[PDB]
From a paper:
PCNA is a ring-shaped homotrimeric protein, with each subunit consisting of two domains connected by a flexible linker called the inter-domain connecting loop (IDCL). CAF-1 association with replicating DNA, and the targeting of newly synthesized histones to sites of DNA replication and repair requires its interaction with proliferating cell nuclear antigen (PCNA), the eukaryotic sliding clamp that acts as a processivity factor for polymerases during DNA synthesis. Recruitment of PCNA-interacting proteins to replication forks is generally mediated by a conserved sequence in these proteins called a PCNA-interacting protein (PIP) motif that interacts with PCNA in a region between the two domains on a single subunit near the IDCL.
The X-ray crystal structure of the R61A/D63A mutant protein was determined to a resolution of 3.3 Å. The R61A substitution is located in β strand E1 and the D63A substitution is located in loop F (residues 62–65) in domain 1 of PCNA. The R61A/D63A substitutions are located on the side of PCNA adjacent to and within loop F (residues 62 to 65), which is over 30 Å away from the PIP-interacting region. At the site of the substitutions, there are small backbone changes around residues 61 and 62. Although the substitutions at residues 61 and 63 only appear to cause minor structural changes near these positions, they produce significant changes in loop B (residues 21 to 24), a region of the PCNA monomer that is more than 30 Å away from the substitutions. Compared to the wild-type structure, there are significant backbone changes in the structure of the R61A/D63D mutant PCNA protein in loop B. The α carbon of residue 21 has moved by 1.2 Å relative to its position in the wild-type PCNA structure, and the α carbon of residue 22 has moved by 2.6 Å. The overall shape of this cavity is similarly altered in the R61A/D63A mutant protein structure. While the D41A/D42A and L126A/I128A mutant proteins are completely defective in CAF-1 binding, the R61A/D63A mutant is only partially defective in CAF-1 binding.
Numbering used by the authors:
A (entry chain A), B (entry chain A), C (entry chain A): 1 to 255
The structure:
């Protein structure tokens, strides 16, 4: 039997919002040490992976590994239901045919209970993360979001280029071209706006804007985004939660 | 305690037949959500991986993850025992020294119970599947089987070559050479004989016929075989079951 | 509740010694079929992975997957405590805030019980092992240790070069250069000093001596070390235990 208590429903809700514009469908693997989930899109160029630890919950009980398949749009529609600060409990049994979502408020006037029908989804969980990436950097989610949103105006392809103490984002299309150049530093006024870079080898990669736009949606979950780039594998964009993380693996373009 | 009920023993039997001409020995990992197993051959150029879900069983109970090591030849010899349409139950305890295979018939005259001695097998399960493969295609198991069987006559090496809307299988040896060229289409007479191709980048790969011959053995498990090819990783041949799959990862030849 | 009995504390102790000069911190994942653990260093060029099976213990009970985070230096300091041949029991509950280490002697005069405070460590377990490595070889731990220790004198970079029936270790620095060349053979006087090589493709790789020095620390756990090399991935150094293994994944240098 699964029983998982979110302090704020907003967390789970916006976590799912994190990867709306979505990879449709997803397998939520719940276990004693918390919840994990991953899903690929139709084109199979973007993998979304999610880990939510126990500490991220107000409360949590499983004692029996349980897999929960469900369509994100249905879940989202169900997740649109409430004050957005309720206590939210996920409930399931030993052989779940359906999952229960339970919203409770400050008092006990409005008790909302929804039941979402589960699904069967075959899925070999992918482990495509690598040991060492050619370059590693991190910056404010908002800044990155802004860069992507701005540059995505000009082209459907954004080129990220990293060299010694230099991070260059470039877009080149029909109407024109644009380039944002940022440089690492330590902001001691408040380190949350700091920009970090660590380069073992320069990189020159190009990504589809469509997807980056989906990546930056996770800005609503963390102050900082961490990007890991290499030419031998999909780029890794990571947003950290209290105890856990939401990460996106994205494949670059060949030519 | 494990208790797993196959409707038809033929399924499990032919599943094991799927990877006879075998990767010798194998670790069957049984858990609440079903069974998984994988094994590599002596040369370590071919990985066989297997997932059997709960729905694929007539019945199934575990409630405690259990690993079952066993030699395929012994198991096969035991699996040769019965009408081939019996109800087949796999039974194990909490600390299994041996596994029980139980065959029962339509009535209750012939009750057959076999006990297979288990084995200790250290094995780091491999996760070599990739997010995106350069090319993806699918076709009738029989057709592919026929192509392999035919071309394997001429050489010990079969070259698969994929370009825009063109799938080319080639063999070149001493006596002569042979090439089968197939093209994608949508068969509306009945889509089971359809041929699908999806190319993000052309490919030119060469495989050992010895192994492909072992791959095509899984034709007895599905109408269609799905092939995923790339130059950066082992090719992936997949046969789908009702709830689960049998897949083969095969390494191409360098030169 | 976890309860794991080592016959000799020396095993566990020296296992941790195996990867001191350490990857700091580590997540010990305990489960019904035994214990696994892995950890990366600060530079993220060296992954240490550990599997300890049930047979390696004098006794073992879990029946509930439990994760145990802990600093290696603290653990080591605690592991310095005892005759070094005590019976050593690891104990934990269902929601461990701390782990118990219990040392008992031949009689029952000195009963030593230590409690180590656990930690929360987010960690996506890496699965970077590959199916086929370009070259595979194995040799006495002592010999390899000696080669590394000797050649590390001259430079901070050791080049391993493998060709047909030829294994060449080279170091080149300021004071001078050095090269050790070994050749495969079958030692029938006693096969433990034998040297094995298996080459599918020649290799020319260079590693940081700093790390190799950390790798060879595991010589105190096995008679033989097994090295698997390829250019497409981190090199794999493996020391085998009774039931389980300690392995190191190391990334070569680009230029």
């Amino acid at each position: 039997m699964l029983e998982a208590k979110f302090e704020e429903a907003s967390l789970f809700k916006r976590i799912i919002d994190g990867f709306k514009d979505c990879v449709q469908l997803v397998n939520f693997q719940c276990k004693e040490d918390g919840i994990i989930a991953q899903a690929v899109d139709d084109s199979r160029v973007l993998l979304v992976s999610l880990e939510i630890g126990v500490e991220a919950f107000q409360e949590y009980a499983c004692a029996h590994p349980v897999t929960l398949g469900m369509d994100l749009t249905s879940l989202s529609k169900i997740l649109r239901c409430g004050n957005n600060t309720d206590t939210l409990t996920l409930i399931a049994d030993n052989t779940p045919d359906s999952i229960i979502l339970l919203f409770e408020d400050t008092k006990k006037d409005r008790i909302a209970e929804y039941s979402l029908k589960l699904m069967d989804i075959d899925a070999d969980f992918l482990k495509i993360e690598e040991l060492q990436y050619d370059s590693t950097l991190s910056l404010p989610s908002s800044e990155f979001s802004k860069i992507v949103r701005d540059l995505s105006q000009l082209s459907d392809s954004i080129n990220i280029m990293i060299t010694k103490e230099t991070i260059k984002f470039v877009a080149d299309g029909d109407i024109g071209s644009g380039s944002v150049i940022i440089k690492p530093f330590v902001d001691m006024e408040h380190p949350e706006t700091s920009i970090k870079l660590e380069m073992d080898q320069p990189v020159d990669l190009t990504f589809g804007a469509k997807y980056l736009l989906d990546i930056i949606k996770g800005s609503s979950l963390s102050d900082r985004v961490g990007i890991r780039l290499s030419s031998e594998a999909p780029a890794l964009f990571q947003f950290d939660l209290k105890s856990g993380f939401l990460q996106f693996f994205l494949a670059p373009k060949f030519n």
